[PDB]
Amino acid sequence: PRGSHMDKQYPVRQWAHGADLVVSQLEAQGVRQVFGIPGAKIDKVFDSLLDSSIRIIPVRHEANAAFMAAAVGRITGKAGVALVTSGPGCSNLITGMATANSEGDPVVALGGAVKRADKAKQVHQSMDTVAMFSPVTKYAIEVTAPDALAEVVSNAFRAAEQGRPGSAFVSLPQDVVDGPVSGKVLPASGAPQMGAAPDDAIDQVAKLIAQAKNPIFLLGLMASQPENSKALRRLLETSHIPVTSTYQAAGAVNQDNFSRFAGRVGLFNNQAGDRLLQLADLVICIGYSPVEYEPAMWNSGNATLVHIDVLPAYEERNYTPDVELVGDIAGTLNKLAQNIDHRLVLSPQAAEILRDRQHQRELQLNQFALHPLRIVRAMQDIVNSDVTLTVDMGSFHIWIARYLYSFRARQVMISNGQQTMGVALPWAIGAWLVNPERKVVSVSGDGGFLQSSMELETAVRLKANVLHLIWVDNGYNMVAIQEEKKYQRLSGVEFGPMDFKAYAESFGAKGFAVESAEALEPTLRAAMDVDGPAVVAIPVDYRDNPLLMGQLH
Amino acid sequence: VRQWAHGADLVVSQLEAQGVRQVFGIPGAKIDKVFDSLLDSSIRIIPVRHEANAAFMAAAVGRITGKAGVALVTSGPGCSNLITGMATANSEGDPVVALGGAVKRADKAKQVHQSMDTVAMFSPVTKYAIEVTAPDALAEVVSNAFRAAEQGRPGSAFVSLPQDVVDGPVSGKVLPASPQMGAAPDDAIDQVAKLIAQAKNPIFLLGLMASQPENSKALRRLLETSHIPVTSTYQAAGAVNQDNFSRFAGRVGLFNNQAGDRLLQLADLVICIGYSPVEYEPAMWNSGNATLVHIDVLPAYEERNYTPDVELVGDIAGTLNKLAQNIDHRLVLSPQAAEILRDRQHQRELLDRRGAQLNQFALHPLRIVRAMQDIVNSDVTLTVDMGSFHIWIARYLYSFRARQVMISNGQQTMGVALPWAIGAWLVNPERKVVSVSGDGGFLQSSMELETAVRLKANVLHLIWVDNGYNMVAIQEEKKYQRLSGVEFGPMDFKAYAESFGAKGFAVESAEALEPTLRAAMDVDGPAVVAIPVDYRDNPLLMGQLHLS
Amino acid sequence: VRQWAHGADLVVSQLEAQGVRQVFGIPGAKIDKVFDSLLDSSIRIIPVRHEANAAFMAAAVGRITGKAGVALVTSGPGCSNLITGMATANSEGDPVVALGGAVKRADKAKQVHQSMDTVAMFSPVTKYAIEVTAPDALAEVVSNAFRAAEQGRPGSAFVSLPQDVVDGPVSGKVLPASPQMGAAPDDAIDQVAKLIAQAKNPIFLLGLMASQPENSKALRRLLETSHIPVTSTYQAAGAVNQDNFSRFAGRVGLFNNQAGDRLLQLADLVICIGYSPVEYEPAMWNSGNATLVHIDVLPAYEERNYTPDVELVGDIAGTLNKLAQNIDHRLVLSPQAAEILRDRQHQRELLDRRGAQLNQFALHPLRIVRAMQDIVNSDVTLTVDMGSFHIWIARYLYSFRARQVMISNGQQTMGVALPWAIGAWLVNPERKVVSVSGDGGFLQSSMELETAVRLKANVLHLIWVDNGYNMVAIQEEKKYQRLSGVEFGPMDFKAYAESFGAKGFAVESAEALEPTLRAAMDVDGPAVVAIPVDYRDNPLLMGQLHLS
Ligand SMILES: Cc1ncc(C[n+]2c(/C(O)=C(\F)P(=O)(O)O)sc(CCOP(=O)(O)OP(=O)(O)O)c2C)c(N)n1
Numbered sequence A: 001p002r003g004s005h006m007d008k009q010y011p012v013r014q015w016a017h018g019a020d021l022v023v024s025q026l027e028a029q030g031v032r033q034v035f036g037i038p039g040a041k042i043d044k045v046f047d048s049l050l051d052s053s054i055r056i057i058p059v060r061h062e063a064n065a066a067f068m069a070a071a072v073g074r075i076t077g078k079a080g081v082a083l084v085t086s087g088p089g090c091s092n093l094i095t096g097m098a099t100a101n102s103e104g105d106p107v108v109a110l111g112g113a114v115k116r117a118d119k120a121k122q123v124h125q126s127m128d129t130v131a132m133f134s135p136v137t138k139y140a141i142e143v144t145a146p147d148a149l150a151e152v153v154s155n156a157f158r159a160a161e162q163g164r165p166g167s168a169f170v171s172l173p174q175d176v177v178d179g180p181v182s183g184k185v186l187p188a189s190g191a192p193q194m195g196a197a198p199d200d201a202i203d204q205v206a207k208l209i210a211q212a213k214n215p216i217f218l219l220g221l222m223a224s225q226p227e228n229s230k231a232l233r234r235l236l237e238t239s240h241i242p243v244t245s246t247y248q249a250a251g252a253v254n255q256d257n258f259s260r261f262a263g264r265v266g267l268f269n270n271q272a273g274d275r276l277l278q279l280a281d282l283v284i285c286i287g288y289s290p291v292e293y294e295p296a297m298w299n300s301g302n303a304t305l306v307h308i309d310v311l312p313a314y315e316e317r318n319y320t321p322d323v324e325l326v327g328d329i330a331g332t333l334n335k336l337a338q339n340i341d342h343r344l345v346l347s348p349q350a351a352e353i354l355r356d357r358q359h360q361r362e363l364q365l366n367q368f369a370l371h372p373l374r375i376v377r378a379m380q381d382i383v384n385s386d387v388t389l390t391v392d393m394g395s396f397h398i399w400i401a402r403y404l405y406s407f408r409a410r411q412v413m414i415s416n417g418q419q420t421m422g423v424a425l426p427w428a429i430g431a432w433l434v435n436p437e438r439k440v441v442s443v444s445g446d447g448g449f450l451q452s453s454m455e456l457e458t459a460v461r462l463k464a465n466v467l468h469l470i471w472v473d474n475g476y477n478m479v480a481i482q483e484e485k486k487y488q489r490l491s492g493v494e495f496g497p498m499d500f501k502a503y504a505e506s507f508g509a510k511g512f513a514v515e516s517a518e519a520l521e522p523t524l525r526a527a528m529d530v531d532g533p534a535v536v537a538i539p540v541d542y543r544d545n546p547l548l549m550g551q552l553h
Numbered sequence B, C: 001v002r003q004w005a006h007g008a009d010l011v012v013s014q015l016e017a018q019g020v021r022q023v024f025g026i027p028g029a030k031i032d033k034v035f036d037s038l039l040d041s042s043i044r045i046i047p048v049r050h051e052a053n054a055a056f057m058a059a060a061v062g063r064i065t066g067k068a069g070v071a072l073v074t075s076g077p078g079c080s081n082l083i084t085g086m087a088t089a090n091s092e093g094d095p096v097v098a099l100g101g102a103v104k105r106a107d108k109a110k111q112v113h114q115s116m117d118t119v120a121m122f123s124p125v126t127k128y129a130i131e132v133t134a135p136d137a138l139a140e141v142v143s144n145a146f147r148a149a150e151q152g153r154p155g156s157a158f159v160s161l162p163q164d165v166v167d168g169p170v171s172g173k174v175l176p177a178s179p180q181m182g183a184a185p186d187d188a189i190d191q192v193a194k195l196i197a198q199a200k201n202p203i204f205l206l207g208l209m210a211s212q213p214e215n216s217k218a219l220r221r222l223l224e225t226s227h228i229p230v231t232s233t234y235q236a237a238g239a240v241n242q243d244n245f246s247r248f249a250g251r252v253g254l255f256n257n258q259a260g261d262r263l264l265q266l267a268d269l270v271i272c273i274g275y276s277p278v279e280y281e282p283a284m285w286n287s288g289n290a291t292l293v294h295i296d297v298l299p300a301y302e303e304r305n306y307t308p309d310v311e312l313v314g315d316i317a318g319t320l321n322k323l324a325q326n327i328d329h330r331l332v333l334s335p336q337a338a339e340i341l342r343d344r345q346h347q348r349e350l351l352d353r354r355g356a357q358l359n360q361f362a363l364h365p366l367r368i369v370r371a372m373q374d375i376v377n378s379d380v381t382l383t384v385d386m387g388s389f390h391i392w393i394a395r396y397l398y399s400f401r402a403r404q405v406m407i408s409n410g411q412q413t414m415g416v417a418l419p420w421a422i423g424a425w426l427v428n429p430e431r432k433v434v435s436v437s438g439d440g441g442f443l444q445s446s447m448e449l450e451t452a453v454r455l456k457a458n459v460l461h462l463i464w465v466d467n468g469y470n471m472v473a474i475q476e477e478k479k480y481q482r483l484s485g486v487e488f489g490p491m492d493f494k495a496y497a498e499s500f501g502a503k504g505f506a507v508e509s510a511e512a513l514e515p516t517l518r519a520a521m522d523v524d525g526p527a528v529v530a531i532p533v534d535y536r537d538n539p540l541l542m543g544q545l546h547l548s
């Protein structure tokens, strides 16, 4: 019995400090570590964590605690935890929480607050944090009653992890966590046993599949979750309907495990996925929400639209599902699969599109600074199926995204709707903490790098096996391209150079700087063999970038 | 897709697609184009006398049909006058869509008069609140309001319509009405079926969604197959009654001596159907010693005292049907369970107070309750306002044999009865509707008597007249032994009702009660009856309530 | 500092310190302790029949006394029923303090029924909205509400009072009533005095604060010394009238042929007093070719069409007195200025329509306006609701010789007239108050007739009866040439009023209008007169309005 008052594993207790109950609750959630920075208003929670199995990981900027937490969330499926103090401690999380929420990464931030009695006073540091976090979280609440302490924390994890996952924020007044409380821990409740979409609705879609000549699956976030993996593969092998994924579902299906994969859609306007979508007469969306890929960019409207997710569709001018299958995805796809009478025979246009994609991929640039394509090829060599890849935001993101089919990484964190900079390095540290035995490669620009570079100290301190690569152009290039194209002049996109090798070494990490085109691969190969934090500076010639951005939406 | 001349045209066409039969409200310049467009549609315009009542009437339509009732008002005070109505609908789970006018998009930046931030005002009391700032999204936003209102656990939705958007041209199409989820997994149902078999004191706790029309047959199938006892929240008051099910333990929420609470505390297995903790605080009934099963259209809203061991989200009707098909045997009632229900029978026999015609003038509450039971049969809808009478009716709710009873009122809003009845009557005009309120609540919505007369609505409104706010006075009496701001003057309610062109009645004798009510029932149209009441016995009734 | 037994005691003591004479509202359990505590105070309890009207009555008290009127309601619907009232008070600059009950502090976290986020709901329509979460801050928060409401440009304030805070004990003291700023700098005043001397077409634009009682004498001193022409917003409608000042150019805001607008466009110097752009959109009058001077208690709320060349913030009364002392000479009117005012005189002579007794039945609007002017003298307060009659009265506002006129209504809220009058009467009971509304607006607040009868309030309410929402119908007629949702049924308003125990009247003849009104005036207590009106001539009047 979960709600029992006589459970030995989860006893009702007269807690000395609210903080103790909080930490006990976190343990029940299966939290392995917490990221953040302490302060007086929250120090008791940090203190209570000393008496628990949960590991404390001090970061150097709170924003990065949110980033690290998201990486943990995306991989484990259990919410990563950020822990900060009140005022600037909380407000420094807001971008991170927005980044986590938009990508569907489960994150729970516990933020300190002034005492309840000091909230009404015009005192400093009494931010309405709940109001500030609400627009960028699924869940935002302040614990005003000590009795609700365990309840609110449990609800935060539930909001973050269940449904379409997202970030959750909890404000903890100082007097509440320091003062005594009566209550018990709430055991963690898994995903609710939800039903498949209605049978009459499933057979209705099955009929459309048979009568369709260019069907295609559009995969969204929820399609990439583990509990849907087996059901998804079963449906694809039974139907052989082609597939294309959003970047939030980039890892849901690979070309190696499915022949009729049409790549990822979201950035480029000339992907096999897009052509098939425009060509489509029937599009079945799985685990997809319009935010992942604007329907205005791919939905011609000429195709019948089917919606399959754990939530109902949020209808809009370019997204009005003709059929709506709401319920457990795995159960829906399983039922749907049992009603596939025959495998799809591809249309000549459909088959040609997939043929063009493979052939193009099956394809010597000693120019200095390094050509982007040279750097991408070098990255592919060192990043294998035992290596996790994290990608920051910038022009390099587009280059890597363009050749994402040829990367053979275990997992790739690249999806970034908010287009937040500085995410790569913290993502890698978070990813490494989940799988320390494996290596993680992070890549950013010089701009994004310096926004989160302070966590290099955290990496050295953790002995994190992370290799960070920097595409150095000494400017904000992805912005400059747009300015050049629109105004034929630049504004505020140029800055000075740095000795990134010596910079990395001042942290106690291994530094590298590619001073020649021929030294690219040897340097990366060497930096990989380092058992610990390493940074590589890679000068890049972005002169060809305007050609690449023309392939975008 | 069509090139619409006015946004208002697209709005009305969308409403038509939603199956809207009528709209309630009051026009203004900022929204008059929508009113104008309704002239060219099958949709009926029903002018009210106060916007708050448009929301109330809309809720009544929503609760019955399951399709959102529609309120239509102008900007500024037109919108702000809806807020109490919208909050009442939302808390009761009544689907309502309010379309509210707004100043032109260009005048929102100027900060001119009548430019309320209505969306901010409506957000705390609605599922959905939005302003249409892009004409292209006009049809999308309206459809989304109906979906938000009608789907999941239903609620109220608000849409702000700038004048220039509804007046100006727009390109777009109507969105066909669409939600329908499948029953729970077989592996989940067999898991619950196993718990029922191994359980010795099972009990169903019925919440809002268990009372929906689409779940009635499936619910009856499960009760007849399992014979597990039942207790309901007041939001599910009409899901099961004492007369149609033998092991009914009454409704829980108000009284401290209900069979349902005793059975819940006794339970070793509690299956909640369509229930959310907000309907009845788990701190009052959940001992935690029982296995807790959750069946609803949404995942459970977990609380410190509500952590379900099993969680079934999906179609309720399909889930309950399947569950019934896997019940191996009917429940054999435990001695303690049977004793509790036996005690309830004796309790029901004691509350009836066999014989003892109460001769008191002013009329004794129980006398009025008995008189109401006589006139309200299975072909009559009953709507109940808020006050002391609410407690009396709620207590003898087991003995009412009404078609439908609208009484659930978490916000405890007064003045809801009459507008509810007008809304309820409009759904089934051929039938009679009885509304009952106090003198306080009556005058807060009495302006709709003219609307009832205009509609020839077959509504009989009863007034418990004490010339005061009694339900407050009693609480003051027990706490302070003195009254403050609970007394006001008398009125000639007969002439008052007749000034509207409705039939007026006044009970001037205890023996004249039933003849008057019967006479008022035989009126084919609006009729009002004033009933003087002696609330001196109320402290005896309030003692049966939860200290709270 | 004292150890209070109940927070409610401290609240009432604070109210006493604020000089509150009465409170309007309706009690409930969550707030009944404050009602109870008012029994032990000099403060009078005035139960209303709908909370919205408590806010309206409170505003009337505020506008007159300058001290905030007080509304007192319970939680949930008690609070949400105030929102329209509070928005109306705030937009008109009426000081109002609403004390609203709330659930216990412990039940706010549980998310239980009746736990509205009232502060979020009231914020968009108040100067000040706060919930008392710390009992120590109880007296501080109440005082701050009054200060927010009364100081600066006045407005409405809301305070949420959790049940346990007002019921539980508290330690604290009362805060004495405190704001008073000094006149503008001498160097600033001499600067303006210089501009007036060098100007050839100066004009005063009077806004809200110019109409406050404390500024009356100082304003009159400045006008008699300068003889600069004057035009007022409707919020300053009663600051100066045509009868008491020769160079009055009427009120600007509604009509497209006012002397004020012409003089403003002609102006080479515009001195705004107590004015904010919200009162009258600068896009309608500010050509920009004139030097602009700003005199108010706050810095100017600058806008694209309102960037004052000179800015005087401070005590208005002291500023205007000093300014007058530095006017070297009276204005010699320009030929264009004199022509405009001459045109206004001919206009006033044309609107009067010399002779021509209008014999029409139903009664012609101008006939009713003439009849109202006869009965409303300088000892009578006039309150005006919203509708077509509002336009008629507003147009002939120059010919009204009333003590005070409450007509300004930016939100254009209906049903304000009667509650305003009850509130106004309570400040000066020995005097008569006349309220006028339409049949639509009447029934939205008609429930307070019982309250008027209970108070023996000497109020005469007039109803322009057309059995419809006429002001909307006209706009529909011009735009669509057809009507929608603007028609409803008739009523016997005489018997309706009499059912309250008030005096009822019905004008059944054009010749019987004045005798009836005179008879109703002679009634010492509540009286209602129904006046059938022929609005067929209205399109002629609406043509005099700004296209808008
Ligand atoms: C926190 C922040 N600030 C600015 C930006 C702008 N930005 C990018 C972006 O998202 C856009 F420009 P858009 O509005 O078009 O979506 S990408 C980017 C990276 C440039 O610096 P870098 O890291 O050195 O990368 P490269 O020089 O190799 O291109 C910036 C600054 C943002 N995303 N986030």
Ligand SMILES: Cc1ncc(C[n+]2c(/C(O)=C(\F)P(=O)(O)O)sc(CCOP(=O)(O)OP(=O)(O)O)c2C)c(N)n1
Residues within 6 Å of the ligand: B386, B387, B388, B389, B411, B412, B413, B414, B437, B438, B439, B440, B441, B442, B464, B466, B468, B469, B470, B471, B472, C026, C027, C028, C029, C030, C074, C077, C078, C081
């Ligand atoms: C809009 C509004 N205002 C006030 C009330 C307070 N009230 C009742 C109520 O809900 C409580 F007292 P609480 O939440 O604290 O339990 S019930 C009621 C009705 C009294 O007037 P009446 O209609 O004549 O009923 P009786 O005299 O026959 O008892 C009031 C005013 C509220 N609920 N809503």
Ligand SMILES: Cc1ncc(C[n+]2c(/C(O)=C(\F)P(=O)(O)O)sc(CCOP(=O)(O)OP(=O)(O)O)c2C)c(N)n1
Residues within 6 Å of the ligand: B026, B027, B028, B029, B030, B074, B077, B078, B081, C386, C387, C388, C389, C411, C412, C413, C414, C437, C438, C439, C440, C441, C442, C464, C466, C468, C469, C470, C471, C472
């Ligand atoms: C709470 C409420 N509801 C509706 C209205 C609309 N209305 C008027 C109004 O303000 C406009 F039309 P707008 O802002 O667009 O100019 S005036 C009015 C009164 C009509 O009914 P009545 O009282 O009988 O007056 P007459 O028939 O004599 O003209 C209405 C309903 C509103 N202001 N407030």
Ligand SMILES: [Mg+2]
Residues within 6 Å of the ligand: A133, A134, A135, A136, A137, A138, A139
């Ligand atoms: Mg949010």
Ligand SMILES: [Mg+2]
Residues within 6 Å of the ligand: A445, A446, A447, A471, A472, A473, A474, A475, A476, A477
């Ligand atoms: Mg760069």
Ligand SMILES: [Mg+2]
Residues within 6 Å of the ligand: B062, B063, B064, B065, B066, B212, B213
């Ligand atoms: Mg229903």
Ligand SMILES: [Mg+2]
Residues within 6 Å of the ligand: B123, B124, B125, B126, B127, B128
């Ligand atoms: Mg909301």
Ligand SMILES: [Mg+2]
Residues within 6 Å of the ligand: B387, B438, B439, B440, B464, B465, B466, B467, B468, B469, B470
């Ligand atoms: Mg009563």
Ligand SMILES: [Mg+2]
Residues within 6 Å of the ligand: C062, C063, C064, C065, C066, C212, C213
């Ligand atoms: Mg004043």
Ligand SMILES: [Mg+2]
Residues within 6 Å of the ligand: C123, C124, C125, C126, C127, C128
């Ligand atoms: Mg505000």
Ligand SMILES: [Mg+2]
Residues within 6 Å of the ligand: C387, C438, C439, C440, C464, C465, C466, C467, C468, C469, C470
């Ligand atoms: Mg009218």
